Amino acid sequence: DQAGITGTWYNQLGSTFIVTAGADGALTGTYESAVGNAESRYVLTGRYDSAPATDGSGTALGWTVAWKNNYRNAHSATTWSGQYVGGAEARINTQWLLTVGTTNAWASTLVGHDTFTKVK
Amino acid sequence: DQAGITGTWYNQLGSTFIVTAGADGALTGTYESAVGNAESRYVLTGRYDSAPATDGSGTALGWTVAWKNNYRNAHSATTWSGQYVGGAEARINTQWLLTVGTTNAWASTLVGHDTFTKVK
Amino acid sequence: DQAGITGTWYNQLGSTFIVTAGADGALTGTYESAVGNAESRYVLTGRYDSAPATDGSGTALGWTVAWKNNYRNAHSATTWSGQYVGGAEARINTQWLLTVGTTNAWASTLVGHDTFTKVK
Amino acid sequence: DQAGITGTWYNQLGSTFIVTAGADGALTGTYESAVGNAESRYVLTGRYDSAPATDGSGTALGWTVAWKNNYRNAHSATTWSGQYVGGAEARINTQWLLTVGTTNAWASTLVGHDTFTKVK
Numbered sequence: 001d002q003a004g005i006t007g008t009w010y011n012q013l014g015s016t017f018i019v020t021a022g023a024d025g026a027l028t029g030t031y032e033s034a035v036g037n038a039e040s041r042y043v044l045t046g047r048y049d050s051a052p053a054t055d056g057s058g059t060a061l062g063w064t065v066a067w068k069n070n071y072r073n074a075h076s077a078t079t080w081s082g083q084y085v086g087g088a089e090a091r092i093n094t095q096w097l098l099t100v101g102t103t104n105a106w107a108s109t110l111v112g113h114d115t116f117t118k119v120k
Numbered sequence: 121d122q123a124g125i126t127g128t129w130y131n132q133l134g135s136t137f138i139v140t141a142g143a144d145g146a147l148t149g150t151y152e153s154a155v156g157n158a159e160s161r162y163v164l165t166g167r168y169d170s171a172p173a174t175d176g177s178g179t180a181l182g183w184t185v186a187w188k189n190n191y192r193n194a195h196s197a198t199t200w201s202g203q204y205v206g207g208a209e210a211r212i213n214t215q216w217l218l219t220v221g222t223t224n225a226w227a228s229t230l231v232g233h234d235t236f237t238k239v240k
Numbered sequence: 241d242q243a244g245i246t247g248t249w250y251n252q253l254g255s256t257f258i259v260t261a262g263a264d265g266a267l268t269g270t271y272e273s274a275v276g277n278a279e280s281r282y283v284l285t286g287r288y289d290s291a292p293a294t295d296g297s298g299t300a301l302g303w304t305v306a307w308k309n310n311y312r313n314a315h316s317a318t319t320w321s322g323q324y325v326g327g328a329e330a331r332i333n334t335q336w337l338l339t340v341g342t343t344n345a346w347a348s349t350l351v352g353h354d355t356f357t358k359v360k
Numbered sequence: 361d362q363a364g365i366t367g368t369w370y371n372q373l374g375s376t377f378i379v380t381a382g383a384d385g386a387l388t389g390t391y392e393s394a395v396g397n398a399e400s401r402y403v404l405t406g407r408y409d410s411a412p413a414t415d416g417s418g419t420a421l422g423w424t425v426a427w428k429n430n431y432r433n434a435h436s437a438t439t440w441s442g443q444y445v446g447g448a449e450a451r452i453n454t455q456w457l458l459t460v461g462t463t464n465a466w467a468s469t470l471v472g473h474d475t476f477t478k479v480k
């Protein structure tokens with residue numbers, strides 16, 4: 001589970017999620033989006049259930065990226081909420097919320113879904 | 121902005137969000153939910169736009185809580201995505217996704233909205 | 241309940257929702273948005289639980305507006321999902337999804353929340 | 361487009377969506393869910409952009425089902441918001457909100473995503 005989550009993951013858009021799962025429930029790493037107003041890697045942090053169902057069938061987790069790095073600032077942040085499912089074709093299945101700051105409040109949040117796998 | 125976000129916040133359900141905004145864009149703290157399968161404080165981590173619009177009118181941010189502490193484990197995680205709005209009646213306006221692990225995938229994610237203020 | 245829902249409602253943005261609840265569970269009417277790429281009235285249709293909890297404490301309902309009328313076409317559609325709560329300060333509390341067609345799939349859907357009341 | 365949408369569609373859960381797209385932008389039909397507190401067919405209604413991009417590359421649409429029929433009442437309603445994409449492998453790509461009435465307001469709305477195809 002700690003072991004299952006730690007590593008490099010890829011979504012359906014070609015984005016790359018590099019994460020380390022801590023014994024304490026921490027997620028730390030970097031995110032590189034293949035799309036949008038983004039380039040290179042962005043810091044992420046999050047949390048996961050460090051004592052889930054032992055069958056690896058669904059470990060709840062989430063993380064945040066703020067879209068500011070040394071190259072760009074998109075004045076926005078995405079949070080992903082989902083679960084890690086272990087096994088031969090391990091997956092992290094997520095839904096996400098992307099909020100844009102000021103750069104029309106009602107129109108400030110996009111929603112979508114990303115599925116991450118261990119192979120691109 | 122760093123200064124604006126750091127502190128104790130309260131939502132409409134009576135929950136308490138204690139956060140420190142780092143110069144580096146980190147959010148760290150604790151969350152206590154007034155509702156659901158939760159008691160006492162849970163670790164949170166997140167990110168915020170550390171170079172936003174300078175008028176404090178909308179700073180993008182997000183954070184995650186995994187609902188495991190030393191009292192309980194609800195095998196779930198919530199992510200909040202939103203923006204900090206400064207001024208006399210400072211607010212963090214969020215939308216959230218709560219994913220439940222295994223404890224029916226299609227029915228695993230709740231969505232809602234929380235508005236945080238500096239006074240309860 | 242049929243009686244409770246039928247009528248004119250107003251949200252926090254100043255939009256106007258005019259609806260008739262049918263005995264058969266139909267919702268029919270018009271929507272005028274105070275915001276976005278919209279003017280005048282748009283057709284809506286939806287459904288509601290025509291045999292809910294009798295205390296009026298929470299009747300599930302939803303409706304759709306496609307943002308095409310004789311004035312404009314924003315090539316988009318919004319769906320509202322929520323519940324009608326009766327009583328002295330009757331409310332329809334909703335969450336909404338706004339999808340934009342082609343005019344970047346991942347960025348095609350906004351999410352938000354609207355609270356409707358019988359007085360503006 | 362009218363022609364493209366009208367017909368029987370199937371999602372990844374094995375649910376069946378039967379719809380007629382009207383010249384006027386109406387969607388009418390029946391929905392049968394393969395999952396949840398549901399059996400047999402439920403009435404749906406919705407709307408679609410009846411003058412979209414002519415390449416069939418993304419027509420915005422939405423619909424509602426209230427989960428009451430002559431067999432069951434789940435005191436809930438789902439709205440789907442998405443777009444129809446034409447071509448050899450035609451699709452309706454949606455995100456959905458399912459609200460439950462009274463049967464804990466904060467926990468009343470599920471969110472997910474369904475992809476409909478013309479073959480099961």
Ligand SMILES: [Ir+3]
Pocket residue numbers: 093473
């Ligand atoms: Ir999914």
Ligand SMILES: [Ir+3]
Pocket residue numbers: 073075103172173
């Ligand atoms: Ir800027």
Ligand SMILES: [Ir+3]
Pocket residue numbers: 113
């Ligand atoms: Ir998708």
Ligand SMILES: [Ir+3]
Pocket residue numbers: 115473
């Ligand atoms: Ir999917």
Ligand SMILES: [Ir+3]
Pocket residue numbers: 213353
């Ligand atoms: Ir809001």
Ligand SMILES: [Ir+3]
Pocket residue numbers: 052053193195223
């Ligand atoms: Ir458990």
Ligand SMILES: [Ir+3]
Pocket residue numbers: 233
């Ligand atoms: Ir609310």
Ligand SMILES: [Ir+3]
Pocket residue numbers: 235353
């Ligand atoms: Ir609000």
Ligand SMILES: [Ir+3]
Pocket residue numbers: 233333
């Ligand atoms: Ir609400």
Ligand SMILES: [Ir+3]
Pocket residue numbers: 313315343412413
């Ligand atoms: Ir157009």
Ligand SMILES: [Ir+3]
Pocket residue numbers: 353
């Ligand atoms: Ir709001």
Ligand SMILES: [Ir+3]
Pocket residue numbers: 233355
């Ligand atoms: Ir609210």
Ligand SMILES: [Ir+3]
Pocket residue numbers: 113453
């Ligand atoms: Ir999608």
Ligand SMILES: [Ir+3]
Pocket residue numbers: 292293433435463
């Ligand atoms: Ir009932």
Ligand SMILES: [Ir+3]
Pocket residue numbers: 473
């Ligand atoms: Ir899925």
Ligand SMILES: [Ir+3]
Pocket residue numbers: 113475
């Ligand atoms: Ir998908």
